[PDB]
């Protein structure tokens, strides 16, 4: 169908599955994934059982095929790639946070750029099992940014004592950021 | 409609035949390849063995076209191929094994490409005849390992209880692989 | 009477708070502060709050003897402390988070300290509100630790993550940590 | 009973006069001092009398005992303490703002004992009669600062009236002067 | 009460908890933490509780007050310093044994420091959940003295066993080595 | 009971003696000393007698115990250290007077330590037996300053002489002082 | 109560047993050292039993509470310090007598504290179960002595050997002494 | 009650004596040590005799135990005290009286500390069998002075011989070493 | 028939006078020198005069023969030699004991002598009157020997606690001498 999802060579898990089921949600396939067992199977769920499992095939890269051997059912297949990948892991947390702490700003990169990689990056920490509150991202952040941005936060901490936002904070930020530049 | 399928041209045989499997029973067509004859044969058989004819013939490639050239149904042309190109050979076998048991890890070429070369292999055997439980798979995948991987291999196959399998010990073998690299 | 109480000098407010409540618990002094205020005072009460208000004056450090200027009872001086003192602001809560997310074990400190200043870590981050769920703990406190620790980390993450304990974790480090000793 | 009021020595009469007066209060003594002259005196009241000039005797110094030598209550030797040592001089007012106002840090100087030096200041400044408030102390605290504070320093200035007390002030300093050690 | 309890920072922790249990059997008190909790809504048992958590409280450092901060039982408190600060290891106790066979003594140092050196080693191991008896204690101990000190090591080993103490081998030594100090 | 009085050592017999009595009257027991005698003696007035003789012993040094060997009240001790170190002596008082005619302010010694050595001389003066008025001690404070105060010197003494008390000369004197210290 | 008792780290055991029952005493609690122990027991002798164990562990140094661990009364904590360190012994008094035969008196301190140590030394080897006459205490005296003594000891001997008190030989010796120190 | 007195070191026998006599006096228990034994002894007698025994311990050093471990009274105890530290001797007599007879004026000492030599001079000649009176003691103290005092010491002497004191003859030579003084 | 005892001859006469009357008691004759004379002499008395007569004439040496030449009876000779003898000190125990303080083992002089010397200075010792027990004895022979004696010194004083008499310690020491003289 879309040829937008890319196959699924075992990263990002999470993009390649919410893909699928958005796809399988167009043809009006996704309640087999998620939905009711009837009692006795009949012709309209008859179809998108094996049209689902078709479309899975259709879209996972050759090493991953053997996760169906013709046997499991379209939804068992994506339970089974649940069990095995988007499992709380305490080893991916770890290496989450271990990379989270290595993010430096470089002049070579914008800002937003920055900002794109440090939610992306945290939402899949999220996706790890591990529970961050907003605060927690927000020192996060802060952590990564250079000498530079040293008067912006502390005025940020002291007036600035209720819309402690990860919003906020990232208007704020980049607010300031024009005044750096131009300064050089 | 699916055109994922790489039309077979004489390499990984398996895969292409799977992807073919899969699309036939999309359609409602399988129950003609594994199944039985029945003696009664009218238009839901007649109609599902053209249609497998035809998609067989599109899928594969011209030069390979001479399998079905005669009126030969889609379940013969299937074992044409099998036995042509799934021989089942126990010198085969001996020799495979021989070679994949002097298969190791070589420091310039990464993780990736020793898990495809692996993959390949057991393809391979699977195809010879050989039968291989996953176990013995893990086995195989874990003694080609290099010495600094000893301790997840250890802590794999005693601390790890739960049902194992090949995609679960390759995610950790990658984890390792990831954090040896971060360390050196 | 109990003559370990620091007096309050600016620092460690929830201490001496928590020493001077339980120093008034002690001589029964402690209702005034907490109980109801009577609509009929007695003789009782009064020498009550006369000694809670002294206890008070005398553990305090000289620079705030403001809090206790005005003619207030006890109850009063301890709610103006609390006020000024028993609150987090978002300076102190970055901080925490920062020093958490920055800490190291030094060569020379033991595991007992490093564990020490880990748990008083999270107290304190747990009495500004900031909810941590035991993963994070355990996370935590494996980047904080140094590369010696790689196999027993490794190890600890193949458990399943049921009965993944802090207790259990701390007593595993230890374990590593005499073998390390012993490797030097 | 306590020993924590060091005897008065000429230097910093307001906490020792504060202490004396909380001391007197603990035995319910303060009575002869501020409450009114009974036209009847009973065995209590010159038992309080007495308890009280011993009591002040005691956390005097030897050098200052001319004052009680006249066998007078100790109503009256607190008041002659007043009249000498806080005494409505505008001179001294003068030169103590002149003092202040020159008051810039030093280096080698911590935060907390320069609280303690602009305490100890606004105290005996207080006491030589010159009527200072809140937002007065603060803009006088703040003046003292050196010019690596300038951002808190307006961050603070531009925060409303009504939530800025010196004690609020004191603890962004500290907490901003920890980031100031820390990044160094 | 009792003074001569050092508050308790994280060192010797058996001699602290010896005295806190010695304290609180004083007040009759070990009732709380000893009993197989009768709990049955007495006012004896509630002050029982309050008078030991404040004891407890009491010689607890400022650092360690987080072990009690929580309103947990006296009992609880005790045995989660037993938990942090008693382990049973057994590796700990192997390092130990290994320290001990290979203690022998040296060259300046006097018989007392080496035997506070054994003790502290002794009663560490015990804390490891090692059972040692008296006579193994004398053995460890006699095999770690110069010859100088032979003649005295055979004789206590040829005596009739039975009923001695360490304690009375200690003063032995002591005698020996002040025999011994006139000679060399 | 109360210990901050020094030892008397035959140096300062003045304030010695007043905290004393001081102390005698916090316990009831001044009674003694200058009541009268009770023409009937009875258990109280006997406990009095005993309790003042071992305050006075107590808190005198171990050269001076020859004034209390003799069998003899607390009363009679004090009679005798009068007649021996108060005793009104006409040299002794000239020889007084002779030296506060020779005292001189010295540069580096502040006023307040002046006011104090010129009011124990004036004291001392007194008990000497030299009748002084106020006047007199006002002409004495202003011919012992230096030339600095010529224009205060000067001016206080065209006030009328009605009101001119020693506080208010000291003050002026204090006053005039802090604008001289100002211009060195 | 009384602090001044040096607790007990295997010193001169006499004057810590001789504190700890005067203290005992002192809070009527010595009746349970001495005292017959009663067919039954109330809460006074229970009360009594458990402030006598409390004040021995409190004035015991840390190295010897061992004596006390296990579940014993104060009598038998005080009988195994007995037994342990006044056994009447051979050793014991065999150093004590070495030591006596080298008690030479020094040139700078006087024969009134070399008396004393001489008897503090009797005093202690009679606490060793080692009998001794009163001549032999004579005996012991004048073997310390120097040759300035030679007269008076000649006398001394020739005296008849019925009524020779060491008083009397005490005094002839201080005698001597102050001829001696005439003749120099 | 009283606590500066010195515990007995072995030194200033008169001064330590002195004190504990009239810490005695002041709990009505002198009349033990004084008073003769009554025929039958109550209670009261019991309970006097107990506690000047425990009041005299603990005022002697450790030293001194063996002075009361015996079961002797208090009233043997400072006789044994006095007997061995005040011995009534002519020698002693015959000795101080040459020291006494030869002890003149130091210039660079004052007539207060020359007083009080003489006082325990003359102390330690009445504690031995010497009977000096009043007049002796002026006619020692008058031969004791230098060549300046020739006009005083006649004119002392020319007075009767019934109304000379101790403190008169001292108030005179006071104030003439003030009239010297100022002459040289 | 009691051939035992040495004739008298001016020396230890008390040991003489004590077996004299032992033999006599023996021989049932010491009612004549001890009973009353009775009022009339019977052929009994006669005969005990003449044997104690002739008994003490035989135990007399030829010197003193001269106090039975006399016709007097036994009880007048035993008056006589009591009333020359009775009293008088055998010797000056003073420098006995002495002397044997002052012992020490001379390098070339022998074992076996030392032993005779310390035998024969206790036998005076002991006959003059002094008492000294075995434990004193063993003492005394230990203080007198040398440093290389030490090993055998504590082997006796550890291992022989209830089996130590003069003749086992001297067995002992000569055996130890032995292999002494042999590392010579």
């Not at 499992?53 to 379209?74: G, P, Q, V």
């Not at 297949?77 to 989270?100: F, G, P, T, W």
Request: net charge negative.
């Amino acid at each position: 169908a879309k040829r937008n999802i890319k196959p699924f060579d075992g990263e990002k898990y999470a993009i390649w599955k919410f893909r699928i089921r958005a796809l399988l949600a167009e043809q009006d396939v996704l309640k087999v994934v998620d939905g009711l067992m009837p009692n006795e199977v009949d012709d309209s769920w008859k179809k998108a059982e094996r049209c689902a499992k078709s479309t899975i095939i259709e879209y996972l890269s050759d090493s991953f095929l053997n996760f169906a051997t013709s046997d499991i059912t379209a939804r068992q297949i994506l339970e089974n790639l649940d069990a095995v990948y988007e499992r709380k892991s305490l080893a991916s947390q770890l290496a989450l946070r271990k990379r989270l702490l290595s993010l430096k700003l470089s002049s070579e990169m914008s800002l937003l750029s920055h900002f794109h990689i440090f939610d992306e990056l945290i939402s899949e920490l999220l996706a790890a099992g591990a529970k961050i509150e907003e605060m927690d991202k927000i020192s996060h952040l802060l952590i990564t940014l250079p000498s530079c941005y040293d008067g912006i936060i502390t005025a940020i901490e002291t007036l600035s004592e209720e819309n402690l936002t990860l919003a906020f904070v990232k208007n704020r930020l980049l607010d300031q950021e024009i005044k750096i530049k131009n300064d050089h």
